[PDB]
């Protein structure tokens, strides 16, 4: 018997996690006049089996949903309700981005209770996660620091005015881009990673990557999408069928640096 009430879907394989699409059919709708942010697209699985967690994803400075869109179908097809947002202003700073990210989660939660909504009854509002690009990534980190009940965080190429995220207890995967010249790894992603001492955490640097290396249309969807889904499944669903995928060093030429902590596949 399956004893984890949050487990959804089939037992994963590397191939099934590297595929463009997961097991579940995904539909979408847009949120008009959102509560506390600029715009939003909600991606959801129609046949997950049960309620699933919610993920809110925020773009970088000047950026729009297009930059992060690919995560919507990718995560939703594995059993998550995902909202990609536009910020009130493309120029909003990381603190504002975090507020708007949390406002998008809050609206997903209200929608879950709205009978007219396509996601009525589809969300477990006690299981939420955060993702984003650059300032949006920083915003995710801020969201995690301010809201420790969040179950997971998977920011990409993050930047914030601070690199001290030592209070974060949320399991946090950082995608870094090796040749990032906007938010260099050495001054942003790595220090943010090093500051976190209280959580399960991972740092995955994409070989040859520019600041947009995890954005829609990237050349590493198979690896990045495998890792993003595995991380969210392992920590949002407590799904130990994803233990290896979430914690392993992908033995891949596509990865220029890999670090992980409190993500053990050993017994001691």
| Annotated catalytic residue 181 | no
Residue 62: other Cβ atoms inside 10 A: 12
| Annotated catalytic residue 134 | yes
The C-alpha atoms of residue 255 and residue 144 are separated, in whole angstroms, by: 25
The C-alpha atoms of residue 204 and residue 178 are separated, in whole angstroms, by: 9
Considering the candidates 67, 211, 212, 237, report the single residue annotated as catalytic.
Answer: 211
β partners of residue 17: none
Considering the candidates 180, 188, 212, 239, report the single residue annotated as catalytic.
Answer: 180
Residues near 69 by beta carbon (within 8 Å), at least 6 away in sequence: 41, 84, 216
Q: How was this structure determined?
A: X-ray
* Binding residue ranges for poly(ethylene terephthalate): 61, 135, 159
Considering the candidates 99, 134, 140, 143, report the single residue annotated as catalytic.
Answer: 134
Nearest-CA neighbor of 174 among 191, 197, 151? Answer: 191
The C-alpha atoms of residue 239 and residue 38 are separated, in whole angstroms, by: 33
Q: Which domains does the chain have, with CATH numbers?
A: 1-268 (3.40.50.1820)
Radius of gyration of the chain from its Cα atoms, rounded to whole angstroms: 17
Write down how long the chain is.
268
Resolution reading in Å:
1.4
* Triad 60, 62, 67: Cα angle to 5°: 55
Query: And the tokens for 238?
Result: 């407590």
φ and ψ at residue 186, rounded to 5 degrees: -65, -25
CB 4 within 8 A of CB 237: yes
| Annotated catalytic residue 267 | no
The C-alpha atoms of residue 160 and residue 192 are separated, in whole angstroms, by: 9
CB 207 within 8 A of CB 178: yes
Question: Residue 10 burial (CB < 10 Å; 0-12/13-18/19+)?
Answer: exposed
* 81-86 sheet: strands from edge to edge: 26-31, 39-45, 81-86, 52-58, 123-132, 152-153, 172-177, 201-206, 255-261
- Coil, helix or strand for 86? strand
List the alpha helices (DSSP H) in the chain: 14-18, 71-76, 94-112, 135-146, 189-195, 221-236, 243-247
């Amino acid at each position: 018997a399956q004893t984890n009430p949050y487990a959804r879907g089939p037992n994963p394989t590397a191939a099934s996690l590297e595929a463009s699409a997961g097991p579940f059919t995904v539909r979408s709708f847009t949120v008009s006049r959102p509560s506390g942010y600029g715009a939003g697209t909600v991606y959801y699985p129609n046949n997950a089996g049960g309620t699933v967690g919610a993920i809110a994803i925020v773009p970088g400075y000047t950026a729009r949903q297009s930059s992060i869109k690919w995560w919507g179908p990718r995560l939703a097809s594995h059993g998550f309700v995902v909202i990609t947002i536009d910020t009130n202003s493309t120029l909003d700073q990381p603190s504002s981005r975090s507020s708007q990210q949390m406002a998008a989660l809050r609206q997903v939660a209200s929608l879950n209770g709205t009978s007219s909504s396509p996601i009525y009854g589809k969300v477990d509002t006690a299981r939420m996660g955060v993702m984003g690009w650059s300032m949006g990534g920083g915003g995710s980190l801020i969201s995690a620091a301010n809201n420790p009940s969040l179950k997971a965080a998977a920011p990409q190429a993050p930047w914030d005015s601070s690199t001290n995220f030592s209070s974060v207890t949320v399991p946090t995967l950082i995608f870094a881009c090796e040749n990032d010249s906007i938010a260099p790894v050495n001054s942003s992603a790595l220090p943010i990673y090093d500051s976190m001492s209280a959580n399960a955490k991972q740092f995955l640097e994409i070989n040859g990557g520019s600041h947009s290396c995890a954005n829609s249309g990237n050349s590493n969807q198979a690896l990045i999408g495998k890792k993003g889904v595995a991380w969210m499944k392992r920590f949002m669903d407590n799904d130990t069928r994803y233990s290896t995928f979430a914690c392993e060093n992908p033995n891949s030429t596509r990865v220029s640096d890999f670090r992980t902590n409190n993500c053990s596949l050993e017994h001691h």
